[PDB]
Design a protein around this ligand. Structure first.
Ligand SMILES: *[C@@H]1O[C@H](CO)[C@@H](O[C@@H]2O[C@H](CO)[C@@H](O)[C@H](O)[C@H]2NC(C)=O)[C@H](O)[C@H]1NC(C)=O
Ligand SMILES: *[C@@H]1O[C@H](CO)[C@@H](O[C@@H]2O[C@H](CO)[C@@H](O)[C@H](O)[C@H]2NC(C)=O)[C@H](O)[C@H]1NC(C)=O
Ligand SMILES: COCCN1Cc2c(nc(C)c(CN)c2-c2ccc(Cl)cc2Cl)C1=O
Ligand SMILES: COCCN1Cc2c(nc(C)c(CN)c2-c2ccc(Cl)cc2Cl)C1=O
Ligand SMILES: CC(=O)N[C@@H]1[C@@H](O)[C@H](O)[C@@H](CO)O[C@H]1O
Ligand SMILES: *[C@@H]1O[C@H](CO)[C@@H](O)[C@H](O)[C@H]1NC(C)=O
Ligand SMILES: *[C@@H]1O[C@H](CO)[C@@H](O)[C@H](O)[C@H]1NC(C)=O
Ligand SMILES: *[C@@H]1O[C@H](CO)[C@@H](O)[C@H](O)[C@H]1NC(C)=O
Ligand SMILES: *[C@@H]1O[C@H](CO)[C@@H](O)[C@H](O)[C@H]1NC(C)=O
Ligand SMILES: *[C@@H]1O[C@H](CO)[C@@H](O)[C@H](O)[C@H]1NC(C)=O
Ligand SMILES: *[C@@H]1O[C@H](CO)[C@@H](O)[C@H](O)[C@H]1NC(C)=O
Ligand SMILES: *[C@@H]1O[C@H](CO)[C@@H](O)[C@H](O)[C@H]1NC(C)=O
Ligand SMILES: *[C@@H]1O[C@H](CO)[C@@H](O)[C@H](O)[C@H]1NC(C)=O
Ligand SMILES: *[C@@H]1O[C@H](CO)[C@@H](O)[C@H](O)[C@H]1NC(C)=O
Lengths: 727, 727
């Protein structure tokens, strides 16, 4: 048998199959197979070809993606896609009339469009072009301009700026149609006084002078963008008069200082829910806003506000949780940290104070996935008390003590990590198992939770892997100070507990992270264990998520302390184990994991021989405001400046004398700026520490272009092999 | 027994002593001893203290340098010095009255002054501040503002812009006093349309956002700065009206296209010499400009212009040569390439055609050093036909065939490389011998060329080095195609030709370079040979200097060809010698040498195991116009674009799979932009070639800060030691 080699990883020789479907109604879904788009009937499994892979053969452009209108009458064709940040991009768009089978050729959606979306019913369109919002009532009719204030890098209507895209909304879009399609809600961001990160972009060899990229980007403590919220009635659009947006003001408790808009959820045709968060992310308010048919205005009764505070840390895992409204819009369910610090499902009634927990226990609800009049469906890590497992549950809304696990026993050896996708109104659901066995996609009907069929079982990959010496994974826990902390180890094939293997500690360790889990992965660690006989371990210490606030908030206002200390202690314990060579322990991480790796290597602990930090944070003052201040507060003498200064990699420079360090960073990293590693190397140079380095010209945080990806893993593999005296 | 170690190099354990003197008249000089300024009488050798080391103890600022006025009455004190590029800087200044022994507190020179200079006689001052020129007649009187057009990065009056500072005048100054101090001539540079190179400067940790540095910098083929020339009468300045600057325009043969002002020399009190050079640097014109008492204008008779052209290359070694005027100003001497392509001294009479060569032979004159009524003094490499030796000669003006060597036989074994400094009117001269033995400084009188006394013989260093196993240096030649090409080897102590040594080829190889010479050096190569037992070789191939145009111009319009090939062939030659291990040959270079090193590693020659390129050029379109176009013409389809494109490092990327490569660059390199290495690394990545790299944050082309310098030589030493399998 051959082994899983670096080339196998880099060339994607062993591929995981997926089953990506889009629910189109309560009983049908779209699935793209062999470039043909199909419609499936969930109950019986029969299908029809909706669009053949030949249709646009003479389109004239490579089609990047498609979006069929809700009523199936039109399809959007996305082409000329050019990526921007994590979510944003620009593209060109054509619209094809499915009824007449022809492209619409006038009043086209413009080129360089920044965002487009169908209404939730029908076929209205909203798009953003040059930072302004436009609406098309019909694909062939001229559009109506909703906003006129948009200016590059300054005013954003209907799309997010850098830090909202990355840290608040996880999306470029800041547009929200009402369930009906009647109203279009949108946010407007103002980056007027936000400072710019500037960095060079070298481009192709032919470019004589490097370009300077400039992005409004608030580092910790700097001026943040401001936000406004508006709602436009899309039924009353006039060809003669500019459209009229109604502003909805943030609560007074937010208007007293810096704040964020952090969630927008339509509750009914005439009720919108808005969540706001103070800049000190301690305090949030949910506003319920009702439409007044006579007034034409939107009002947010103060008495309806729901306030959420934390004294232990910040609000929510990364932000306040999403509300899930009942059909009538009069009550909702939301995940909330309970009195014991565990995140559970809470039932809220509008116009009543407080809430009622419907789940409890020493485990957490991960997400609320569907809600009907009879049941609420949710994913949690309760099963077998493993925080790194995930299963689907349903809870009987008329008796909260009746909770049934829908996924726990379907295939208990192969499947312990589930996610789910329900059709509209929750008639059917697709289950997606991610491990520990090969991913398995199944379809089910909710009425009695019957298994309908297997959609994808990865039998092909399974056959291929029969010919390979694959490594194994152990998931278990150690005890630090009377508490359980979980770890995982990728073990080489034919693991012999009597031998001594080198160990690489793979770290992330950011707040609410989880690197010990039951999911199946084919990655670099697979190669390291399979071919180089290296154990790759990961550990979830203080600050990790899904185990309660006592663990997650331990790190509050003190990044670079307990989570770094805990990675060190985990390695010590692994070294005790009689199968680890304590002379050959390495560490590596990317991003937050680069910071932790650097702090660990700079600790003088003597535990680690060498380490690799990829695109590390080095000083919290250099990273973005929304993320950083959530854990660290503000970098002022009045607040947390002292710990901002005590938690830099640079201050530990001298201790790097005791280790081999490889430092790697993309020069076009718009996220963790090259600046951060530039300051690390200068501190090392100033104190006479030798180290190794590699910049990646024009790569960003992901160092993800095909050639750079191959190059960085090839470079790191040489480094780790050298460090471990492996032939 | 000890060797010359890395730490000795880095920490300067063994220091070379100097004897820097400043002639202040025909028979006296200034010399600093224990920070005491002494004046010495050249004839008799007696001295006295001019300025006590204690004089300025209560000054309140650290004094960076001083400049005494020509008449001994005042001394300028430079403090708050801040370096800019190679020559430019800003500083604060104070003038101390030596007769009153008081600091002058009235009408002070402003802070952030860019350039200052006394008149050549008396005590007038011209300085530049905010890009405008000012003149003080007396140190305690208000200054007269001469120009009003100065503007940062756009209009420079009396100082040079980036490219003129670096490539044209080798100085920040663009002011020239007439011998009398009557006139002040000055250039004005206009950079309005020159593009900017932009790069990040990260600064101290405490700086939250990196700064973008922007410098007007014309890359090859881009818009160059424009230049004007003016002359002001300093004797007729008024406190009422502004100075009247008379413009002298360039010849009409220059005005037809882009051109440079390349040399300014005052011939008499009323005659200025100006040399102009076309942007295509094979055509230059010398103008002789005379003052007209009656009109106050300067007139340049078109008829007495001297024209210089080249068909095989560019004009001059790096630029048209300096004219040396006879006292009366009616004739001059200047170095000119003769009919055989050897650079010799030519005698020109103003208003007469052609010139008369007063020297000849297969060797070159390096510089004209002094001129009296009886003799012209010059440095050449005639002695023993060694192009890398330098000696002082004098030629009898009344009989050109009487040429006397003044330095050749002073100490033939210790001293073969001299420079010289003559007193005012050349009554005395200081000889400075730089090798092959320890530097030796002596004083002589011109009357009969009698040695007066030894000034510094480095006996102290000599006694220390006797305790060290020092390397020897061999200087010799190999014959390629019936031409002699010279090389040097730094050989390890107790060299044994029956042994095999690893060899490092130390490369520069730029046009008119010379890396094989008789100079004594204590450098990185000294450590490599003495401690690590590595032979460090350099070779002067096609394109090299001081050997005639056949060799120097071989590289015309073809950079990255013959000079690269010849380094490879030299390496082959070196292997065929029995004391070289051909499995351990490396190559390294900085700047142009980093370019050549990269081209060599990318040639696929198989000769070199590994190499290091520091701050290399990677393609000629990225480097500056004046230097690049001198050798390469313009990068246009009608001129030389094809060879610009065929001579990049990037196009050889695939071939780097055969070698180990270390690429190093400073991020704030204003000269060879980080961009050049950014593009090399991108090409290697794109093609799947592993290599090593190191950036140096905020270091410029010299990577010369104390900590960076130590870091880079330490890093390179590890790399060579690994590549050579050395303990
Ligand atoms: C975006 O925010 C900026 C800065 O707050 C606003 O700029 C101000 O605009 C008003 C009137 O134009 C005045 O207060 C000042 O003249 C501006 N101050 C600054 C700092 O420039 C700007 O109006 C906002 N733009 C939008 C579309 O809301
Ligand atoms: C420096 O050069 C600039 C650029 O050529 C000169 O600006 C030009 O001046 C003329 C006459 O005023 C205008 O008609 C042009 O439009 C200008 N060109 C540009 C691009 O601005 C400028 O006058 C020069 N400055 C000095 C002091 O010589
Ligand atoms: C290769 O990246 C490692 C995995 N990460 C890191 C990551 C991801 N997503 C988001 C939204 C964020 C928040 N900025 C982050 C993130 C977290 C911390 C720091 Cl210091 C930097 C970053 Cl970028 C993600 O997927
Ligand atoms: C550490 O530098 C190595 C030695 N050099 C290189 C050097 C020096 N002086 C001048 C005026 C120049 C012309 N720009 C150069 C130079 C020549 C070629 C290239 Cl491609 C880059 C450069 Cl910088 C010098 O002293
Ligand atoms: C006395 C006199 O003419 N001085 C002028 C001054 O007024 C003017 O501001 C400047 C710019 O042209 O030139 C000078
Ligand atoms: C188009 O679809 C057919 C099946 O209907 C498939 O066999 C063929 O490979 C497809 N062509 C592609 C993938 O472009
Ligand atoms: C499935 O089959 C039924 C019965 O013929 C048919 O009516 C329905 O349209 C089919 N669904 C799809 C998506 O083909
Ligand atoms: C978009 O660009 C394409 C080519 O770049 C051009 O043919 C077309 O006119 C543009 N389309 C629109 C809708 O502006
Ligand atoms: C959708 O809701 C709005 C607000 O209640 C209403 O005015 C409009 O008529 C509705 N649209 C449809 C399709 O009836
Ligand atoms: C346990 O307590 C000790 C002492 O208070 C402390 O050093 C250590 O970090 C703690 N460990 C954990 C993981 O709680
Ligand atoms: C040298 O000595 C002579 C004779 O005393 C004296 O006049 C002269 O000033 C001295 N020069 C110096 C510079 O000490
Ligand atoms: C130079 O700067 C210093 C510090 O601000 C100031 O005190 C001093 O007066 C300045 N000197 C002159 C000549 O303006
Ligand atoms: C210096 O030379 C110029 C030549 O025109 C003359 O006008 C001036 O008088 C001279 N100055 C002195 C100080 O003799
Ligand atoms: C010698 O001549 C041959 C061409 O016939 C060429 O390969 C080689 O480069 C030449 N060497 C030198 C230094 O002239």
């Amino acid at each position: 048998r051959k082994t899983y080699t670096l080339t196998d990883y880099l060339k994607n020789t062993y591929r995981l199959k997926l089953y990506s479907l889009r629910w189109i109604s309560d009983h049908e879904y779209l699935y793209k197979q062999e470039n043909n788009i199909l419609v499936f009937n969930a109950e019986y499994g029969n299908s029809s070809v909706f669009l053949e892979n030949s249709t646009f053969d003479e389109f004239g452009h490579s089609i990047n993606d498609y979006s069929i209108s809700p009523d199936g009458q039109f399809i959007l064709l996305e082409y000329n896609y050019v990526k921007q940040w994590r979510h944003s991009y620009t593209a060109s768009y054509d619209i094809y009339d499915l009824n007449k089978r022809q492209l619409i050729t006038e009043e086209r959606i413009p080129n360089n469009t920044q965002w487009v979306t169908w209404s939730p019913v029908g076929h209205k369109l909203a798009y953003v072009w040059n930072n302004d919002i436009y609406v098309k009532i019909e694909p062939n009719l001229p559009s109506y301009r909703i906003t006129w204030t948009g200016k590059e890098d300054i005013i954003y209507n209907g799309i997010t700026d850098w830090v909202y895209e990355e840290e608040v909304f996880s999306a470029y879009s800041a547009l929200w149609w009402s369930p009906n399609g009647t109203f279009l809600a949108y946010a407007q961001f103002n980056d007027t006084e936000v400072p710019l990160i500037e960095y060079s972009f070298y481009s192709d060899e032919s470019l004589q002078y490097p370009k300077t990229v400039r992005v409004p980007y608030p580092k910790a403590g700097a001026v943040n963008p401001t936000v406004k919220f508006f709602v436009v009635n899309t039924d009353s659009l006039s060809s003669v008069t500019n459209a009229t947006s109604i502003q909805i003001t943030a609560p007074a408790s937010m208007l007293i200082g810096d704040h964020y808009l952090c969630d927008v959820t339509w509750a009914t045709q005439e009720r919108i829910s808005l969540q706001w968060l103070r800049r000190i992310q301690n305090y949030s308010v949910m506003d319920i806003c009702d439409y007044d048919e006579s007034s034409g205005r939107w009002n947010c009764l103060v008495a309806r506000q729901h306030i959420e505070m934390s004294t232990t840390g910040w609000v929510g895992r990364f932000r306040p949780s999403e509300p899930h409204f009942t059909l009538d819009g009069n009550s909702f369910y939301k995940i909330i940290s309970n009195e014991e610090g565990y995140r559970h499902i809470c039932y809220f009634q509008i116009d009543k104070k407080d809430c009622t927990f419907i789940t409890k226990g020493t485990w957490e609800v991960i997400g609320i996935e569907a809600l009907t009049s009879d049941y609420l469906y949710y994913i949690s890590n309760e099963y077998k008390g493993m925080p790194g497992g995930r299963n689907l549950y349903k809870i009987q809304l008329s008796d909260y003590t009746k909770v049934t696990c829908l996924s726990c026993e379907l295939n208990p050896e192969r499947c312990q990590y589930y996610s789910v996708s329900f059709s509209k109104e929750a008639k059917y659901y697709q289950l997606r198992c991610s491990g520990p066995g090969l991913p398995l996609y199944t379809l089910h009907s909710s009425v009695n939770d019957k298994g309908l069929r297997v959609l994808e079982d990865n039998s092909a990959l399974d056959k291929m892997l029969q010919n390979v010496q694959m490594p194994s994974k152990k998931l278990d826990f150690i005890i630090l100070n009377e508490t359980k902390f979980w770890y995982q180890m990728i073990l080489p094939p034919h693991f012999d507990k009597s031998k001594k293997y080198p160990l690489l500690l793979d770290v992330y360790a950011g707040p609410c992270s989880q690197k010990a889990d039951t999911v199946f992965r084919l990655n670099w660690a697979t190669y390291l264990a399979s071919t180089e006989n290296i154990i790759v371990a990961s550990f979830d210490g203080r600050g990790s998520g899904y185990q309660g606030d006592k663990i997650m908030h331990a790190i509050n206002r003190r990044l670079g302390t307990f989570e770094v200390e805990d990675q060190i202690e985990a390695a010590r314990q692994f070294s005790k184990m009689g199968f680890v060579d304590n002379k050959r322990i390495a560490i590596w991480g990317w991003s937050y994991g680069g910071y932790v790796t650097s702090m660990v290597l700079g600790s003088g602990s003597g535990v680690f021989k060498c380490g690799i930090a990829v695109a590390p944070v080095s000083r919290w003052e250099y990273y973005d405001s929304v993320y950083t201040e959530r854990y660290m507060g503000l970098p002022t003498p009045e607040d947390n400046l002292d710990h901002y200064r005590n938690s830099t990699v640079m201050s530990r420079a001298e201790n790097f004398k005791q280790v081999e360090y490889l430092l790697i960073h993309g020069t076009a990293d718009d996220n963790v700026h090259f600046q951060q590693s530039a300051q690390i190397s200068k501190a090392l140079v100033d104190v006479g520490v030798d180290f190794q380095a590699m910049w990646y010209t024009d790569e960003d945080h992901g160092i993800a272009s095909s050639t750079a990806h191959q190059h960085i893993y090839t470079h790191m593999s040489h480094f780790i092999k050298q460090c471990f005296s492996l032939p």
